[model samples]
Target: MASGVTVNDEVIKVFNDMKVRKSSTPEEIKKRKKAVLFCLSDDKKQIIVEEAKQILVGDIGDTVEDPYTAFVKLLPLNDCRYALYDATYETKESKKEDLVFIFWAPESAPLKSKMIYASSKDAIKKKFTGIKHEWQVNGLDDIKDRSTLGEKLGGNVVVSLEGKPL
Candidate 1:
C-alpha cells in the first residue's frame, strides 16, 4: 500500500511551494471555478481549431491580397468571451474584427516565441496573444489537405478527435 506521504513527498512539496493562499469573493470564486472547468473542456479545444481563419478571408470586404497570416492560435480562452474580448472594430472591413485574443492559459505559459513548437506536447505550459485566422478550408476536401500540412509540421489534425480527418 502507498503511504500517500513520502520521506520526500515530491508532488506535495511542489504543491506546498506553489500553493496560492488567497481569499475570493463568491462571484470571484464562482468565476474562477467556471473558468477552470471551461479551460479543461472541449469548447476550449473547439475554438483552438478555429485558427487560420483569422484573416476574415471569406468576407467580401477582404479585398486585400493574400491577407493570410501564417500563425496559429494557442489554447485556453478562460473567461475572455464574457464580453469585450469578443468585441471588434472595422480595421479595414465593414464588420469589426475581434480585438480580444483568447489565448492559452498564461499560467500554462504562452507561445510568445515561434511557429514550430506551439503544438509540441510540452508547449501547453505557455501562451501568448491567441491568433485569429481564417484557417479556412477552401473545399470539402480541403481539410484533408490542411491535416496533411499539419502532419508535415509534426502534428496531426484531430478533426473530430475521431470522426473526420479535418
Candidate 2:
C-alpha cells in the first residue's frame, strides 16, 4: 500500500470526453472510495489508470447517453517508442462510478493491478533519468528521448496501433 499517489492533470484529461447516463438501484447499502494505480515496465513504457463521475439523479446508458463507450490512448508515452491504452470493465451508467486500465506496452504487461498511478508520460523516462542521476550525477551524458527502446538496442522503434504504425 502506498502512502498516496499524485495523479497528473494530463492523465485525468484522458477521460474528460467520456459521457454517461444514470438511474437509481434497489434499496441497499453502498460503499465507495477513490483509487489510482500506475505501472511501468522494467524498461519504462505504457500506462494504466481509472476514473469516476460527479453527482447524478439516475444511471447512464439505459436511461441516458453513455458517451465514449471506452478509454483509449491518444498518443505515445513520453513521445517515446510506443504506448497503448487497454480500457476494460467500462459501464454505461451516468452519475455513477467508472474505471479504466492503461497499458505501457511491455512494461504494462507485468502490472496486474496496483493502487499507484504515474504522474506523466515523462515520469517514466524521468525514472531512469533519476536513477541514473542518483547513481552519479556528474560525468554522465543526458539520456535523450527515443521513438522506441530498440533504438538503443540496434533496432528500430516503430510507432503504430494494432500493427499500424503512424
Candidate 3:
C-alpha cells in the first residue's frame, strides 16, 4: 500500500526555508514560520504544504497561544497529516532547537488513509533533510505533554510545558 506518493518540490522548498530562516530581530523572527504542515494532494500522488505558522511573539500580543499548541490544533481529528515543527528545548547547558517531523494519524481516521500515510511516510522523510526528531501520534494523549516528547528526544532536555517562549 505504498500509494506511489512523492513529495512535491514546493514542499521541500518550504521545509528548507523553515530550517534556515533564523533572524535576530523580533519583527523578522516573528515573520519566520515555526512549523510547516504537509498533506497529500487530492489524488494522493504528491505531498504539499497544507499550512504554516509564524513564530508567536508574546510582546506583540497577537495571540496568547504558543506554536506547539497551534501546530497540534492544525491537525485534523479524523485525517492524517505530516508536519515539521521547530521545537525549542532547554538542556543543562543551553537552549536548543530541534526540527521535529510528526506523523499525525489518529486511530479514528479511515483505515485506508492511515495505511497510505504510514506507507508513504518515507517519501517525505527522505526529502526533508535535517529532522532531529520524529513522532507517530495516534491520539491527543500521545502528545498532551511536551515532556513526553522531550523524553523521547533522548536526553535531559525539557520542552517547557508552560508555553513560556515558544
Candidate 4:
C-alpha cells in the first residue's frame, strides 16, 4: 500500500530495469515482494514458515494458504539467506493479487509497509548492513541484470505469476 516511490533518475533507471511491474520471474525481477514476519524475540533469526502463511491470509483474502512467501535477509551469524515458502492450501499459483511484504525494522512505534517499500535497498543496506542482509535465507539466485540492482543486490527474488480468473 505505497504511493509509489520518490526515486531519483539514477535509482529509477535501476528500478525500471529491475522492477517486476508486469509478467515477472525471479530471473528478471528485483524488489520482489518483502514482508516483516515478526518474531516473539529479536534473538530469533529464522522466520517461521507459518508467519508467511499468515500474511498471505490477509493479502489474498482467504484463510486458505494459497500464498507463496519469499524473503531476503542479512544477519550476524549468516551472510545472506533467501527463502520462499509455499503457503498454498492446494498447489501454489503465482496469480495472486496485492501481495504483502512485512519487513522487520523493529515492530515498535508507528510502522507501515509503505514506508519500508519506499526505502532504497542501498539506503537500507547502508543502515542495517548485516541484520538486513540475513533476511533472505533460502531461495534461488544467478539472476540477470533486469532482475538485479546492478550488483548492489541481486538473485532469488520470490515471485508468483498472476493470471486471469479460471
Candidate 5:
C-alpha cells in the first residue's frame, strides 16, 4: 500500500549537497554534516528532517561521544526513523567513503508505526538517489558495533559520521 508520502524539499537539498561534492574550503568542509535523521510528518504526508549533525555530539555534561554512538543514542527507543550516514573504510589498497541509508524500526515500536515507516520509506529513498548501502535495523544488536556494518561492506570500516577524525 502506498503511504502517499513525499520527501520534503529540504531533504532533497541536503541529500544533493552531500552526494555531490563541490569545491569547498576547509571551513565549509569542517562544517559539513555527515548524518541526517528523518521522520514522517505528524500527518504522515511528508518526510521531514528530525535532525542533522556534522558531529553527533552528546549532551555537554557527558564525556565526548563518537558520532556512531551518538547517532544510536539519538534514536527513539520505541519509534521508527530514517537516516543517512556517511561511512568511511579502508581496503588493502585504498580508502573509500560511501553513503548508507538506514531504516530504523525498533521492535518496541507499535506495529502501526512500523507499518507506516516501512511503507513510506521508498518515498525518501527514491528521491535520495545513489545510496551505496541500505540497512534495516529492528534491534540495537543489529547495529551496535560499527564493525558489523564494516564486515558487510567488506573492509575495515569506520563510521565516518563527522568530518573530524575520531
Candidate 6:
C-alpha cells in the first residue's frame, strides 16, 4: 500500500506552500471549493478554457459591434459582388440616402464572408428566409428556404416561429 506521503515528505512541503489553511475565512473556503468544483465539471472547464484561449488570442470581441472589418478592408482583393440600390445622393450632414448594398458571397466550399444590403425594410424581408436571416436580428421570413440557407452556413434552421427562432 502507498504511504500517502512522498519521499522526504514532499506532499507536506507542497501543502505548506499553499495559502489554504483551516484558519481561512468561510468566504475564502467556499470560493476555493467552488473553484475546485468548477475545474472538475467538464462543462464549466470547457467554458473557462475556451474563454481563456479567446483572451490570449485576442479573437474575442468586447461588443456586439465587433468587426467583420477584415472583410471590408480587404474588399479589393477578394471575389466579392455588391449591389448598390441607389446612385444619386450628395454627401452632407443631417442627410440620408435610400441605399443598401447587397454583397454576394460565392456559394462554394470551405466558407467565406457573406454580406447583404436591403433597399427597403420590405426588401430586407424578402431577402433572407428563416433562421439564416435572423442570426443577429429577428425571425425567418420564409421557413424552408431560410432553413436551407442555414444548413449552407453550417447551422441548423432551428424550426421556430417568425420573430422567435428559439
Maximum-TM-score candidate: 3
What digit string (tens of lDDT, one per residue) describes model 6 on residues 1-166?
A: 3211111222122223222223256444322211000010132111011111111012213321222232233223233222211111222222222222233333331122222122221233232222122222111222124343333333343332111232
Candidate 4: list runs displaced more than 4 Å. 1-20, 24-94, 105-166
Give the distance in Å from residue 33's predicted Cα in candidate 4 to where it truly belongs.
7.1
- Write candidate 5's Cα lDDT for 1-166 as tens digits: 4446677776787688668744357545544556778887767777777753334212321443566666777787698888876665665555677777888888889988777766768878887788767888876788886566775554444333223322
Task: Assess candidate 3 and give its lDDT.
Answer: 0.69
For candidate 4, the lDDT comes to: 0.27
Q: Put the candidates in lDDT order, highest first.
A: 3, 5, 4, 2, 1, 6
Model 4 C-alpha lDDT per residue in residues 45-163, reported as the tens digit of each score: 22222233222223433343323322222211212222221221111333232221223343232333324333433332233322322332222232212222211121232232222
Candidate 2 Cα misplacement greater than 4 A, ranges = 1-5, 19-99, 105-166
Can you write out model 1's per-residue Cα lDDT over 63-96, one digit (the tens) per residue?
4242212122212222121100222222212332
Q: What is the lDDT of residue 125 in candidate 3?
A: 88
After aligning candidate 1 to the native by TM-score, how far in Å is the CA of 153 from where it should be? 25
Please state every model's RMSD to the true fold in angstroms: 18.1, 16.7, 3.3, 16.4, 4.4, 23.1
- TM-score of predicted structure 3: 0.82
TM-score, every prediction: 0.17, 0.19, 0.82, 0.19, 0.79, 0.16
Residue pairs in steric clash, candidate 3?
A: none
lDDT (0-100) at residue 98 of candidate 5? Answer: 70
lDDT of each: 0.24, 0.26, 0.69, 0.27, 0.67, 0.23
> Which 10 consecutive positions of candidate 5 have the poorest summed lDDT?
52-61
lDDT for model 6 = 0.23
* Winner on lDDT (4 vs 5): 5
Question: lDDT tens string, model 2, 1-166?
Answer: 4343333333333333221212234221111111222333333334433233221122223333432221112222232121222212212231113332322332332232222333343443333221111110011121112222212222233333222232
